Amino acid sequence: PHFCPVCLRAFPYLSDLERHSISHSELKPHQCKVCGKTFKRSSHLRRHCNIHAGLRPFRCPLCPRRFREAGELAHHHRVHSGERPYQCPICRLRFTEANTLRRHAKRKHPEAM
DNA sequence: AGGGTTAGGGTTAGG
DNA sequence: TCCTAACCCTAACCC
Ligand SMILES: [Zn+2]
Ligand SMILES: [Zn+2]
Ligand SMILES: [Zn+2]
Ligand SMILES: [Zn+2]
């Protein structure tokens, strides 16, 4: 395997080690020449380039909202299905999105959750 | 005060 | 094994 010099995590392949190593650096070697913003990873720049095309591809059949990815439309569908699968173990309230529950825990239960 | 929205971080599935 | 990008996740902004 291949271990990292910083965190000393081992990885199966060399490509696995080199892509992880970017996380420990601060260089942003990618710049969008449309708006000027810089980016850390090639995939960040290419995802950001999609913004300048104007319209996200994934349309919700039930409302006018659009999304970059299929997974983000699926999560959005909970708005319509009414599902709240993220339940706080302390207060037992149910939330639609995991980040809503996380921000709820840190604000309402600072004694960890 | 709560969480919706957008954009950007790292992470992982699969071609 | 490598690479694209969809994925998971959170900061910032704001209704
Ligand atoms: Zn490392
Ligand atoms: Zn740009
Ligand atoms: Zn919708
Ligand atoms: Zn709670």
Numbering used by the authors: 113 to 225
What does the paper say about this structure?
Here, we describe ZNF524, a zinc finger protein that directly binds telomeric repeats with nanomolar affinity, and reveal base-specific sequence recognition by cocrystallization with telomeric DNA. ZNF524 localizes to telomeres and specifically maintains the presence of the TRF2/RAP1 subcomplex at telomeres without affecting other shelterin members. Loss of ZNF524 concomitantly results in an increase in DNA damage signaling and recombination events. Overall, ZNF524 is a direct telomere-binding protein involved in the maintenance of telomere integrity.
To understand the interaction of the four zinc fingers with the telomeric motif in atomic detail, we crystallized the ZNF524 DNA-binding domain (107-237 aa) with telomeric DNA and solved its structure to 2.40 Å. In the crystal, each crystallographic asymmetric unit contained one ZNF524 minimal domain bound to a telomeric duplex DNA. The DNA molecules in the crystal are coaxially stacked, with the terminal A and T bases of neighboring DNA molecules pairing to form a pseudo continuous TTAGGG duplex. Each ZF adopts a canonical C2H2 zinc finger fold with its recognition α-helices inserted into the major groove, making base-specific contacts through both hydrogen bonds and van der Waals interactions. In agreement with the DNA pull-down and ITC results, all four ZFs form direct, base-specific interactions with telomeric DNA. In particular, ZF2 is central to the DNA interaction with the four amino acids Arg153, Ser155, His156 and Arg159, making base-specific contacts along a 4-bp region. Similarly, in ZNF524 ZF2, Arg159 donates two hydrogen bonds to the O6 and N7 atoms of G9, forming a bidentate H-bond interaction. Additionally, the Nε2 group of His156 donates one H-bond to the N7 atom of G10. However, Arg153 forms a van der Waals contact with the methyl group of T11, deviating from the ZBTB48 structure, where it recognizes the GGG triplet. Here, the RxxHxxR motif of ZF2 recognizes a TGG triplet instead of GGG, while the GGG triplet is jointly recognized by ZF2, ZF3 and ZF4.
